Amino acid sequence: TTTRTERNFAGIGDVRIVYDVWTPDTAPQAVVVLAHGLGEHARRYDHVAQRLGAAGLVTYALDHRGHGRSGGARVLVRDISEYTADFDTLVGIATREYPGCKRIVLGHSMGGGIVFAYGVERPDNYDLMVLSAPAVAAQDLVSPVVAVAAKLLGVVVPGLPVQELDFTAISRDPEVVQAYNTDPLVHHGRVPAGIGRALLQVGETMPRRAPALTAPLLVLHGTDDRLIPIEGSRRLVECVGSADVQLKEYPGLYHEVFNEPERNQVLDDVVAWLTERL
Numbered sequence: 001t002t003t004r005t006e007r008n009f010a011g012i013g014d015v016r017i018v019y020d021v022w023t024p025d026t027a028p029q030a031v032v033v034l035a036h037g038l039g040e041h042a043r044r045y046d047h048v049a050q051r052l053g054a055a056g057l058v059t060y061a062l063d064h065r066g067h068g069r070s071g072g073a074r075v076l077v078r079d080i081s082e083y084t085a086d087f088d089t090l091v092g093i094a095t096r097e098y099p100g101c102k103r104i105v106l107g108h109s110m111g112g113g114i115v116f117a118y119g120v121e122r123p124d125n126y127d128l129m130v131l132s133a134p135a136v137a138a139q140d141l142v143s144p145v146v147a148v149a150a151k152l153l154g155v156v157v158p159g160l161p162v163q164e165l166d167f168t169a170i171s172r173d174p175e176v177v178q179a180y181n182t183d184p185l186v187h188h189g190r191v192p193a194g195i196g197r198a199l200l201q202v203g204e205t206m207p208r209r210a211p212a213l214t215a216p217l218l219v220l221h222g223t224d225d226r227l228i229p230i231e232g233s234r235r236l237v238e239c240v241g242s243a244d245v246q247l248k249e250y251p252g253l254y255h256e257v258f259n260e261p262e263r264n265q266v267l268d269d270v271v272a273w274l275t276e277r278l
């Protein structure tokens with residue numbers, strides 16, 4: 001059994017950042033610090049934390065600013081460093097509470113871009129990285145017109161909507177799509193300029209900064225992901241400095257591999273990989 005404790009801290013700008021700590025009833029083997037993606041929140045990761053907890057891992061998971069239970073204007077950000085700074089605070093909380101534990105940083109989609117950006121800035125502050133469909137090549141997905149709009153408007157009017165996404169592509173399971181669309185904590189609007197700018201900041205610098213990532217790296221990606229094409233993860237694993245880097249491709253899976261019907265197999269793979277490398 002893994003128990004959830006809800007806490008908060010003051011993020012950049014004195015925003016209230018809510019986070020969960022999931023603690024198993026066994027001696028802790030390592031600590032996972034988890035970053036969710038755009039428009040969602042950490043309580044879409046209960047089952048992930050519970051599965052990791054069965055492996056003896058403690059999971060810290062925040063709601064990013066403008067998401068879920070945390071404060072701030074919804075999906076408002078001006079710079080990727082807002083997200084990575086708050087992520088860094090959570091890593092520091094985990095480090096102080098479990099100083100004898102290795103640290104795993106885990107991110108999905110936009111959260112994978114956040115974790116990647118954190119990981120190249122602080123490569124000695126964690127031991128292992130796991131990324132689910134990381135949004136690290138957004139420049140391939142944003143048209144030239146809204147790339148200009150996002151880069152010129154993203155700090156002046158970060159809340160300005162510039163594009164809509166097909167949430168029905170998050171999963172092959174209609175129950176997952178339905179639960180997403182009815183979740184009051186999920187953002188159901190358009191993607192705003194500030195998010196676009198932050199996504200472009202990660203993607204434009206990924207090839208030049210990826211060599212600084214030398215920790216063991218596991219990337220998970222569904223081959224039928226229509227939100228973040230798998231080619232971006234294939235490029236990522238070619239650019240990182242890590243010698244111990246793997247991309248596990250899941251044939252037929254959609255974007256949210258941790259929520260797909262095969263999620264217990266995906267999570268078995270993650271736990272097996274972590275077990276070998278801790």
Ligand SMILES: O=C(c1ccc(-c2cnc(-c3cccc(OC(F)(F)F)c3)o2)cc1)N1CC[C@@H](O)C1
Binds near residue numbers: 228
């Ligand atoms: O984090 C993510 C996420 C997934 C996918 C994209 C994505 C793909 N293509 C664009 C995109 C493309 C053009 C303009 C644009 O607008 C912007 F220029 F950015 F303003 C954005 O965004 C972004 C975030 N998710 C999905 C739900 C949950 O699984 C967590």
